[PDB]
């Protein structure tokens, strides 16, 4: 079977309990994770150890907190105490775990299932070919020896409008924001980088990225995490918002793809 789980945010106990609930069996089953594996929850170290050990039985996309962790590890950004990253950063296998983490994709595609995954979703300004190329470019810099220069460059809220003519720093920043920070769009599809609330309480003319028709969503189901204020509701057919806020005292959600059956694990704190 195929299982898709939203943002774990260091909630290792809840992850393991949910996976035992569905009897997840590496070799017979595959697990999809929406990213933001780490931070806020107490168990980022255990989460990373486990997900890395799954190997080919897991398909991960990186989220904004995974990228932030990489930036802290490389000394680009400052550690926020609330993230609870110190046990992972000080772990004897920190190098192993994080060098593995920076090699993981921003985008997963399964053609037989017609299924696409990224942390924040797919901007309506991208077709599948363009999303693929952008994911490849950013993954290539993330997996290179020079990845801390990229991590430093990534921070920023501009430009927020895609164009194939974008070059250099602006292009990489947009790609990063579209995959890992996107929530609301302007009607022309341009990113808004500020509002993090639920769609009903957002100001006009902002609309959810998935409320705007785009070539990828027209042909593929899209699964994503990231947008916890959504609470996994209010999406159209073929759009699966899996982040139900486990680190926030909400719930960890698992979707079995074959029968679209949901399994839910309450937060422990």
Ligand X SMILES: Nc1ncnc2c1ncn2[C@@H]1O[C@H](COP(=O)(O)OP(=O)(O)O)[C@@H](O)[C@H]1O
What residue ranges bind Mn ion (CB under 5 A)?
7, 36, 63-64, 226
Q: How many CB atoms lie within 10 A of CB 88?
A: 26
Q: How many CB atoms lie within 10 A of CB 85?
A: 22
Q: Which stretch binds ligand X (CB under 6 A): 16-24, 95-103, 144-152, 193-201?
A: 193-201
Strand blocks (E) in 146-260? 184-185, 207-208, 221-224, 239-241, 251-256
Strands 221-224 and 115-117: parallel
CA–CA distance, 74 with 67 (Å, rounded to integer): 11
Among 6, 11, 33, 36, binds ligand X (CB under 6 A): 36
Residue 7 or 192 having the CB closest to ligand X: 7
Per CB under 6 A, 65 contacts ligand X: yes
Per CB under 6 A, 197 contacts ligand X: yes
* Minimum separation from the CB atom of position 250 to ligand X (A): 7
Per CB under 6 A, 13 contacts ligand X: no
> What is the DSSP secondary structure assignment for residue 32, as one 8-state letter?
E
Half-sphere exposure of 66 (CA within 13 A, CB side): 34
* Minimum separation from the CB atom of position 65 to Mn ion (A): 6
Per CB under 6 A, 121 contacts ligand X: no
Describe the chain by its helix, strand, coil percentages, rounded to 5.
40, 15, 45
* Minimum separation from the CB atom of position 183 to ligand X (A): 8
Per CB under 6 A, 155 contacts ligand X: no
Find which of Mn ion, ligand X, none residue 248 binds, CB within 5 to 8 Å per kind: ligand X
Residue 243 or 257 having the CB closest to ligand X: 243
* Concatenated DSSP letters of 35-63: S--SSSSS-HHHHHHHHHHHGGGEEE---
Residues near ligand X, by CB under 6 A:
7, 36, 64-65, 196-198, 226-229, 231, 245, 248
């Amino acid at each position: 079977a195929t299982y898709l789980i939203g943002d774990v945010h260091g909630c290792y106990d809840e992850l393991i309990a949910l996976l035992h609930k569905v009897e997840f069996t590496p070799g017979k089953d595959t697990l999809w994770l929406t990213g933001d594996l780490v931070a806020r929850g107490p168990g980022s170290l255990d989460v990373l150890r486990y997900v890395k050990s799954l190997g080919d039985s897991v398909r991960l996309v990186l989220g904004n907190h995974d990228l932030h962790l990489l930036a802290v590890f490389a000394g680009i950004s400052r550690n926020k105490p609330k993230d609870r990253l110190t046990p992972l950063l000080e772990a004897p296998d920190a190098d192993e775990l994080l060098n593995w983490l920076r090699r993981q994709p921003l985008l997963q595609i399964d053609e037989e299932k017609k299924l696409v995954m990224a942390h924040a979703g797919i901007t309506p300004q991208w077709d599948l070919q363009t999303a693929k190329e952008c994911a490849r470019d950013v993954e290539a810099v993330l997996s290179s020896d020079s990845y801390p220069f990229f991590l430093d460059a990534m921070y920023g809220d501009m430009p927020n409008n895609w164009s194939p003519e974008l070059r250099g720093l602006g292009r990489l920043r947009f790609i990063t924001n579209a995959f890992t920070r996107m929530r609301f769009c302007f009607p022309n599809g341009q990113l808004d980088m500020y509002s993090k609330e639920s769609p009903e309480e957002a100001p006009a003319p902002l609309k959810p990225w998935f409320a705007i028709p785009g070539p990828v969503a027209e042909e593929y189901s899209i699964a994503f995490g990231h947008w916890a204020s959504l609470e996994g509701k209010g999406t159209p057919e073929g759009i699966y918002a899996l982040d139900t806020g486990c680190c926030w005292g909400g719930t960890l959600t698992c979707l079995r793809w074959e029968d679209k059956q949901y399994f839910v694990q309450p937060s422990n704190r």
